[PDB]
Coordinates of C-alpha atoms and ligand atoms in Angstrom, one line a residue:
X1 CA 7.5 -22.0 -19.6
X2 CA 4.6 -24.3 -20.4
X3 CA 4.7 -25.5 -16.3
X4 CA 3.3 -22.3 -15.6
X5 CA 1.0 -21.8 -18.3
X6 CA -1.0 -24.6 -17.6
X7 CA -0.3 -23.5 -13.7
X8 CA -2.2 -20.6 -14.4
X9 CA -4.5 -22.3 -16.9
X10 CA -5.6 -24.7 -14.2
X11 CA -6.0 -22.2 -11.6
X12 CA -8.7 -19.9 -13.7
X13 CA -10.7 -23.4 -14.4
X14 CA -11.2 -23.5 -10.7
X15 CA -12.1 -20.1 -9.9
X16 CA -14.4 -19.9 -12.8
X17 CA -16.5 -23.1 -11.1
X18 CA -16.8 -21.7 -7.5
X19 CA -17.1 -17.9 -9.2
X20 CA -20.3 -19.3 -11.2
X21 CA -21.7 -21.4 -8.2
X22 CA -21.0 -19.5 -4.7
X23 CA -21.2 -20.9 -1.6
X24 CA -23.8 -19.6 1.4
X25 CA -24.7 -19.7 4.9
X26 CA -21.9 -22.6 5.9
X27 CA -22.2 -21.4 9.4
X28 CA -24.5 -19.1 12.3
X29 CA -22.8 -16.6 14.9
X30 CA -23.3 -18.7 18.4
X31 CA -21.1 -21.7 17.1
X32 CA -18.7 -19.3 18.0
X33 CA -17.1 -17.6 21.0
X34 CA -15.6 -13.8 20.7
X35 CA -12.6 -13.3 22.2
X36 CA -10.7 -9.9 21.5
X37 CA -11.7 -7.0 18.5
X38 CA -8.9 -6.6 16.4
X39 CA -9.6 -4.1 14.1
X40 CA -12.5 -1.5 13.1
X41 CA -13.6 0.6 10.7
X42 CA -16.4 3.2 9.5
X43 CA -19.0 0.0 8.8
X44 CA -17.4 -3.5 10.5
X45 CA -14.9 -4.9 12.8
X46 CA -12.7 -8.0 12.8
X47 CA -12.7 -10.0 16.0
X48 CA -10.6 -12.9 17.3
X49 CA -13.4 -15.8 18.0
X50 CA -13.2 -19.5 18.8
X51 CA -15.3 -22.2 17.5
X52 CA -17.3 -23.7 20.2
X53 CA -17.3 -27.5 19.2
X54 CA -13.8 -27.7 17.0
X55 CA -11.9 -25.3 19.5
X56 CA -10.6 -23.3 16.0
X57 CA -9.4 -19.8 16.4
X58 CA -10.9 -17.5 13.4
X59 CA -10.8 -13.9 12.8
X60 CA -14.1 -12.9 12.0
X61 CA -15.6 -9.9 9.9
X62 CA -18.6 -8.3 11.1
X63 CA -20.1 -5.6 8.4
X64 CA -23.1 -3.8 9.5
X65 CA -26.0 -3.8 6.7
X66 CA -27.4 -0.6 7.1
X67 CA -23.8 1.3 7.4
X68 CA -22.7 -0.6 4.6
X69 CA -25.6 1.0 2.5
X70 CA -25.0 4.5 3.7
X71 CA -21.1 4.1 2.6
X72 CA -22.1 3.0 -0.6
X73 CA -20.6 -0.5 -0.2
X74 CA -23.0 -2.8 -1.7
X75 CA -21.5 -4.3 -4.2
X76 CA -18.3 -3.5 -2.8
X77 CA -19.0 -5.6 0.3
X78 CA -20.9 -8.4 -2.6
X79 CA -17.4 -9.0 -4.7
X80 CA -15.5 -9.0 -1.8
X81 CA -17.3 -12.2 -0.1
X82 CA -17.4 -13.9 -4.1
X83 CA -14.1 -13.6 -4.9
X84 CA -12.9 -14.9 -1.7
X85 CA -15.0 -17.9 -1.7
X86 CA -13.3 -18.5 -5.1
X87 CA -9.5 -17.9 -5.0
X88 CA -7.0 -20.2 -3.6
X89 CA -3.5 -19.3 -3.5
X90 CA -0.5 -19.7 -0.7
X91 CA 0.0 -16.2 0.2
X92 CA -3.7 -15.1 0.2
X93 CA -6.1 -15.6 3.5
X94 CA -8.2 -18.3 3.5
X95 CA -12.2 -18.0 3.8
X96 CA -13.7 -20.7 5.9
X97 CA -17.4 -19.7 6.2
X98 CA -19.7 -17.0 5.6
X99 CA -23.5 -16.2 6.6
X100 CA -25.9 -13.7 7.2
X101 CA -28.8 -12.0 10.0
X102 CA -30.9 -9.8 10.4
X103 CA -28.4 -7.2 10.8
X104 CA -24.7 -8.1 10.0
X105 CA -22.9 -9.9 7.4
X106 CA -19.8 -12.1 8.3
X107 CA -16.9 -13.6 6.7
X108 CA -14.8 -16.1 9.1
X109 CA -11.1 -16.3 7.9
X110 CA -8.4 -18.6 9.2
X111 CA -6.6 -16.7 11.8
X112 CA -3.0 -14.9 11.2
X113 CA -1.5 -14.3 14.9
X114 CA 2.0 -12.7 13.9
X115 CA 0.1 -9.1 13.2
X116 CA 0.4 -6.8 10.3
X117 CA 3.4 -5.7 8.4
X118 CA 3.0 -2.6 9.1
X119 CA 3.4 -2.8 13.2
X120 CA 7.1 -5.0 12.4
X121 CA 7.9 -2.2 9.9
X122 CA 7.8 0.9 12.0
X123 CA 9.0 -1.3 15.6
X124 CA 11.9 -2.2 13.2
X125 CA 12.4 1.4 11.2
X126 CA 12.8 -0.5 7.9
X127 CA 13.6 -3.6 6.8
X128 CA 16.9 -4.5 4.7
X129 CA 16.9 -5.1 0.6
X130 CA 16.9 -8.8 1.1
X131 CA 13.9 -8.6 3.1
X132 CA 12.1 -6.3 1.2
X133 CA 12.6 -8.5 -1.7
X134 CA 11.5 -11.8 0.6
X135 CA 8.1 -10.1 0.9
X136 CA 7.9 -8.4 -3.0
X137 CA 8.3 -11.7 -4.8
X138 CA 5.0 -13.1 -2.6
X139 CA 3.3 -9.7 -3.9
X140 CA 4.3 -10.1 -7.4
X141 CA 3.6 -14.4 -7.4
X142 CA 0.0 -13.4 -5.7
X143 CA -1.0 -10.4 -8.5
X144 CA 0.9 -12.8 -11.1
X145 CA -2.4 -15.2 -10.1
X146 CA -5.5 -12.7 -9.4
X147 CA -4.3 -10.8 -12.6
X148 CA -4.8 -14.2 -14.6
X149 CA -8.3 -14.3 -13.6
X150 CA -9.2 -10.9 -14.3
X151 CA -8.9 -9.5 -10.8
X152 CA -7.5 -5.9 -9.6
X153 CA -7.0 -5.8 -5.8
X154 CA -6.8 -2.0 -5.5
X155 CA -6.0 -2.0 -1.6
X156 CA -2.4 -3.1 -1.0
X157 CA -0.4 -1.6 2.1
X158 CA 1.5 -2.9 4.7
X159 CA -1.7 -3.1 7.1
X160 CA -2.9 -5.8 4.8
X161 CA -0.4 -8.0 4.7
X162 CA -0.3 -10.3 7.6
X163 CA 2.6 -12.3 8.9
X164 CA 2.3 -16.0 9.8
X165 CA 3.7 -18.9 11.7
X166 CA 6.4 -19.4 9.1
X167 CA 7.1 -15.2 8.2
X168 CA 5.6 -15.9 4.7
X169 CA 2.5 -13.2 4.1
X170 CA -1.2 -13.7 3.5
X171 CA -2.9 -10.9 2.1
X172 CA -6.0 -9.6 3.9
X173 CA -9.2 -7.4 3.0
X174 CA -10.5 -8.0 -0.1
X175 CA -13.1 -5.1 0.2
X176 CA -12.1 -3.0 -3.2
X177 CA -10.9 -6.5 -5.4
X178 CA -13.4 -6.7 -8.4
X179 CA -13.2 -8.8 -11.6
X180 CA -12.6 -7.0 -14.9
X181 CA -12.6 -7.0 -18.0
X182 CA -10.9 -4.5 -19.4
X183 CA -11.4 -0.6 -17.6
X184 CA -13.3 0.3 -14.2
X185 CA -13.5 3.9 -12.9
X186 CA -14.3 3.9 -9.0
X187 CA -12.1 6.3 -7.0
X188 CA -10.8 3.7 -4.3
X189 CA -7.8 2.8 -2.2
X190 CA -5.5 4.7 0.2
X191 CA -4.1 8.0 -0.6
X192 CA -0.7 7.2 -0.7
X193 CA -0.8 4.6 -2.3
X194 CA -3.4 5.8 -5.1
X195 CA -1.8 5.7 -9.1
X196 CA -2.0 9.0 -11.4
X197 CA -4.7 7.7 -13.3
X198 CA -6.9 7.0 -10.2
X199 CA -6.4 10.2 -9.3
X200 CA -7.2 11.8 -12.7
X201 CA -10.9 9.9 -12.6
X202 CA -9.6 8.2 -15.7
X203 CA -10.7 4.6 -16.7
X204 CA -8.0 2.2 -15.1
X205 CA -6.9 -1.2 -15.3
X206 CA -4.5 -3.7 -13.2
X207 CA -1.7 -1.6 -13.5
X208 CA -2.9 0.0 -11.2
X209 CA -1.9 -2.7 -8.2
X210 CA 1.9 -2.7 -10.2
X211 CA 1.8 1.0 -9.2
X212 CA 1.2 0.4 -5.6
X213 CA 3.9 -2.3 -5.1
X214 CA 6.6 0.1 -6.3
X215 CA 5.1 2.2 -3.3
X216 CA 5.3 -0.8 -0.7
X217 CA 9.1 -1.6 -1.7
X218 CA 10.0 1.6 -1.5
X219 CA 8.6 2.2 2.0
X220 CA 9.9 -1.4 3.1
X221 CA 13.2 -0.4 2.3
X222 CA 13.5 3.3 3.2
X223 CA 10.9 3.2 6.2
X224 CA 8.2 6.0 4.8
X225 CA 6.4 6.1 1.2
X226 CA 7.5 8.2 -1.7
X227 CA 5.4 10.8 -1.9
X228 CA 4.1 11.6 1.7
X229 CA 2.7 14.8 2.5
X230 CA 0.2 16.0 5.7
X231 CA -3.2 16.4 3.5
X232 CA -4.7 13.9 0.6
X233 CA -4.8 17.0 -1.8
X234 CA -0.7 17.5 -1.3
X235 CA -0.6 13.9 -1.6
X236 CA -1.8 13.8 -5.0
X237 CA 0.0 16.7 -6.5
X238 CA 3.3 14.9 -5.5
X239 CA 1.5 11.3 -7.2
X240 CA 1.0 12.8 -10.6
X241 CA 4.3 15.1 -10.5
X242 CA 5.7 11.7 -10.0
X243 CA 8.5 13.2 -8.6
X244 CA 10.5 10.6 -6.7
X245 CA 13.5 11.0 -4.8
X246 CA 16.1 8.0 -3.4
X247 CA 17.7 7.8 -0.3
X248 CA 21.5 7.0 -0.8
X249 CA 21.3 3.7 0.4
X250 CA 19.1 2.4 -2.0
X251 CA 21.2 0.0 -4.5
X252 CA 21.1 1.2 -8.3
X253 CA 19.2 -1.7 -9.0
X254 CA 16.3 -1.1 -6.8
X255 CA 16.2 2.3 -8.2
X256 CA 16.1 1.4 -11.7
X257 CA 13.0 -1.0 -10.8
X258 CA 10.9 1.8 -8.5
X259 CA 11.2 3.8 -11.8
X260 CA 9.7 1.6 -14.0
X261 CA 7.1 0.5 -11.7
X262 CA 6.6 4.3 -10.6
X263 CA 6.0 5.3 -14.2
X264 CA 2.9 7.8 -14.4
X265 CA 2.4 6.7 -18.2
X266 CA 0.5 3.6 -17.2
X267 CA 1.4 2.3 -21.0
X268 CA 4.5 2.6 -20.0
X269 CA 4.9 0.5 -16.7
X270 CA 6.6 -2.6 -15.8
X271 CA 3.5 -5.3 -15.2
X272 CA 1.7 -3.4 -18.3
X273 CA 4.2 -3.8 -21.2
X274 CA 4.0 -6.2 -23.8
X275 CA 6.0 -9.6 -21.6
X276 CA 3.7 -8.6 -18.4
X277 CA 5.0 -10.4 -15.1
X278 CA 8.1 -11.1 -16.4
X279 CA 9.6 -7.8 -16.9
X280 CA 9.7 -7.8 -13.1
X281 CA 10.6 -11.4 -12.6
X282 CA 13.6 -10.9 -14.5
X283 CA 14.6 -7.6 -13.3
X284 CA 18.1 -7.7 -11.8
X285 CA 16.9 -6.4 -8.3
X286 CA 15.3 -9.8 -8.6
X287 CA 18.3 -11.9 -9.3
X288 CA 18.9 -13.9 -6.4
X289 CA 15.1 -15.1 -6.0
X290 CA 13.5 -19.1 -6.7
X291 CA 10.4 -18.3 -7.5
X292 CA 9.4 -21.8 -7.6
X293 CA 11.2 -22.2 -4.3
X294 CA 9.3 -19.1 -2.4
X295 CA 6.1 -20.7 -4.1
X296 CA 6.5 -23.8 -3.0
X297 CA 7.7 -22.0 0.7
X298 CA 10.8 -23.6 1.4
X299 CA 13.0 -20.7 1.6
X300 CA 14.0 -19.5 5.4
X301 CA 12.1 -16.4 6.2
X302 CA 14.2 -13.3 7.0
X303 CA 11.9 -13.4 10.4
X304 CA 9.8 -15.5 12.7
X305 CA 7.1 -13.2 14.7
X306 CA 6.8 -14.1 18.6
X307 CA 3.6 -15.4 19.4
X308 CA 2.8 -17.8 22.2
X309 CA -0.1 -20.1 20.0
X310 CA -2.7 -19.5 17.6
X311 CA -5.1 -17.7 20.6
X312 CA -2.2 -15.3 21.0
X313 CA -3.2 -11.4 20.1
X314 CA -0.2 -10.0 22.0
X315 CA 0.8 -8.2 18.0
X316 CA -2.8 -7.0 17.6
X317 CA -3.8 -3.6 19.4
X318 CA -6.3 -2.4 22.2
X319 CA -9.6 -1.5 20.9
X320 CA -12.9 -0.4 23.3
X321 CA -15.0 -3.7 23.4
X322 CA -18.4 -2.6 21.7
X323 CA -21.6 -5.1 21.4
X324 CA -22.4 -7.5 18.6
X325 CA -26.4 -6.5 18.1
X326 CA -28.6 -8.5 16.3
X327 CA -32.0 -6.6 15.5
X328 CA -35.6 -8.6 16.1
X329 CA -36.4 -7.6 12.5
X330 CA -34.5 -8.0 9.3
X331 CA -32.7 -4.8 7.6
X332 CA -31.9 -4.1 3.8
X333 CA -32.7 -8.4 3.0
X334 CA -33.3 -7.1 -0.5
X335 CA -30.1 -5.6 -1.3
X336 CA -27.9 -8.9 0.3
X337 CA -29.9 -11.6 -1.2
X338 CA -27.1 -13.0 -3.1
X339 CA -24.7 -13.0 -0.1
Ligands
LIG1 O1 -8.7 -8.7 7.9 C1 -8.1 -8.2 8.8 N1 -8.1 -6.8 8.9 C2 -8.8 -6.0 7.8 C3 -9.5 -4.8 8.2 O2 -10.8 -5.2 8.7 C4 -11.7 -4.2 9.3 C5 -12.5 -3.6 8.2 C6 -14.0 -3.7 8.4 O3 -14.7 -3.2 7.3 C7 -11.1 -3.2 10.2 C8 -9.7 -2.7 9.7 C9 -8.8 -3.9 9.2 O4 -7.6 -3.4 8.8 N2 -7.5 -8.8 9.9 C10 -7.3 -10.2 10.0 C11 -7.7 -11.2 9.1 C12 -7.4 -12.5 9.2 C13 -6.6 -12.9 10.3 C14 -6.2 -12.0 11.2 C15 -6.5 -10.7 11.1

C-alpha cells in the first residue's frame, strides 16, 4: 500500500541526514551517578546510572579502548554508535548521548527495567503461539525498517530483546549491525543462531537476520532452539544439515512458516523472495495480527513484567562490582576519532 511506501520512504530521508552528520560528545561521565552493573562482556559492561541534575535512570555502555582493539572491534564498536544515533523506530532502544575519554567509550540508552526475554522465557518454560507471535510481528515490523535502509542486525536472541513498561520489546546491542550494500563476509553472531551461509564463510546478505528469527520463534514456542548441541562445531553440522525436527504441539501453520524461514538455500527463503516482507506478513501463522495496530502499540500485551519504578533492577542479575578507571593519558585517540 502506498501508506507504507512513503512510511518507509520517509523514514530512510531521516536516517540518511543524521547517518551523514553524526552527533558527538552530548555528555561527560560525572553528570552521572552508577548504580548497579548489569551486564559484561569480554571488552565493556552496561551499568544502571542516574543523571545527577535531571534524576533520569539510563543504562550505560562502557567499552574499553584498548580491549576493544585487541578483539578486533573497531569498526565494529564505530557502526554500532552511527547507526544508533540515526535510527528511530518503536520497538528499537533509544540512544540519548554518547562521549568519549581517555580510556572508555560510552553510549547512554534510555533504560528498559522489565529484563531480557530470555530470563521470562526459561522462568516461564515457553511461551504460547499467541505470544510468540505477539513478540515475532515487533521483530519482523523492526527488520521490515532497518532492511529499508540497508541495515543487517546480525545479533538477534532472546538476550537482546528487552521487555518494557507496556510488554512491547526494544531491541538492544547493536554491536554487529552494519549498513550494506549488497554482500559482507564477517563471521559474526551467536552459534545457534548463525545461518548456513555464515557458516560456510560465504558472502551474505540480510537474509541472514530472516534466518535467525525462524530460530527465536521456534525456541519461544518450544522452550530450546532447533538445532542445539554441547560444542559450536556440533552446532554447525546440525545448521547446514538443516535438519529440523517439530515438537507435536506445534500448529501446522507454524511449521510450514519455520520451514520456509529455515530454508538453507538462502535464494530460497521467506524475507529473500521476490515480494520480500510480505511473504511473512501474509503467512497464515500470521492471520490474526494488525500490524498497523501492534505499530501503533495499542494491542494488550500477553504480559506485564513486575517492577517497582524505573530504578528497579530486581529482573537484572548479580554481577562483582569492578571500577570505572580513567587513565591520566589518552589511549588509541587515533583509531576513535570519528566517535
Ligand atoms: O544493552 C544491554 N545489554 C547488551 C550487552 O551489553 C554488554 C556488552 C558489552 O560489550 C554486556 C552483555 C549485554 O548482553 N542492556 C540494556 C540496555 C538498555 C536498557 C537496559 C539494559
Amino acid at each position: 500500500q502506498e501508506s507504507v511506501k512513503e512510511f518507509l520512504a520517509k523514514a530512510k530521508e531521516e536516517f540518511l541526514k543524521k547517518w551523514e552528520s553524526p552527533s558527538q560528545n552530548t555528555a561527560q561521565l560525572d553528570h552521572f551517578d552508577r548504580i548497579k552493573t548489569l551486564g559484561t562482556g569480554s571488552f565493556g559492561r552496561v551499568m544502571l546510572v542516574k543523571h545527577k541534575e535531571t534524576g533520569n535512570h539510563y543504562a550505560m555502555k562502557i567499552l574499553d579502548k584498548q580491549k576493544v582493539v585487541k578483539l578486533k572491534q573497531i569498526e565494529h564498536t564505530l557502526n554500532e554508535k552511527r547507526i544508533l544515533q540515526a535510527v528511530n523506530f518503536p520497538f528499537l532502544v533509544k540512544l540519548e548521548f554518547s562521549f568519549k575519554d581517555n580510556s572508555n567509550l560510552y553510549m547512554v540508552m534510555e533504560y528498559v527495567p522489565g529484563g531480557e526475554m530470555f530470563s521470562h522465557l526459561r522462568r516461564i518454560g515457553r511461551f504460547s503461539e499467541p505470544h510468540a507471535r505477539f513478540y515475532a510481528a515487533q521483530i519482523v515490523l523492526t527488520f521490515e525498517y532497518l532492511h529499508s535502509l540497508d541495515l543487517i542486525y546480525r545479533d538477534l536472541k532472546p538476550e537482546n530483546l528487552l521487555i518494557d513498561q507496556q510488554g512491547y520489546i526494544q531491541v538492544t546491542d547493536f554491536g554487529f549491525a552494519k549498513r550494506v550494500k549488497g554482500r559482507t563476509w564477517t563471521l559474526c553472531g551467536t552459534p545457534e543462531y548463525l545461518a548456513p551461509e555464515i557458516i560456510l564463510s560465504k558472502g551474505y546478505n540480510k537474509a541472514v537476520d530472516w534466518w535467525a528469527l525462524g530460530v527465536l520463534i521456534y525456541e519461544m514456542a518450544a522452550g530450546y532452539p532447533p538445532f542445539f548441541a554441547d560444542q559450536p562445531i556440533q552446532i554447525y553440522e546440525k545448521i547446514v544439515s538443516g535438519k529440523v525436527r517439530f515438537p507435536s504441539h506445534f500448529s501446522s501453520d507454524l511449521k510450514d512458516l519455520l520451514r520456509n524461514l529455515l530454508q538453507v538455500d538462502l535464494t530460497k527463503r521467506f524475507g529473500n523472495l521476490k515480494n520480500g516482507v510480505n511473504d511473512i506478513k501474509n503467512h497464515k501463522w500470521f492471520a490474526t495480527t494488525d500490524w498497523i495496530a501492534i505499530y501503533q502499540r495499542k494491542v494488550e500485551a500477553p504480559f506485564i513484567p513486575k517492577f517497582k519504578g524505573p530504578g528497579d533492577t530486581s529482573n537484572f542479575d548479580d554481577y562483582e562490582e569492578e571500577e570505572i578507571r580513567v587513565s591520566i593519558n589518552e589511549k588509541c585517540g587515533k583509531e576513535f576519532t570519528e566517535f
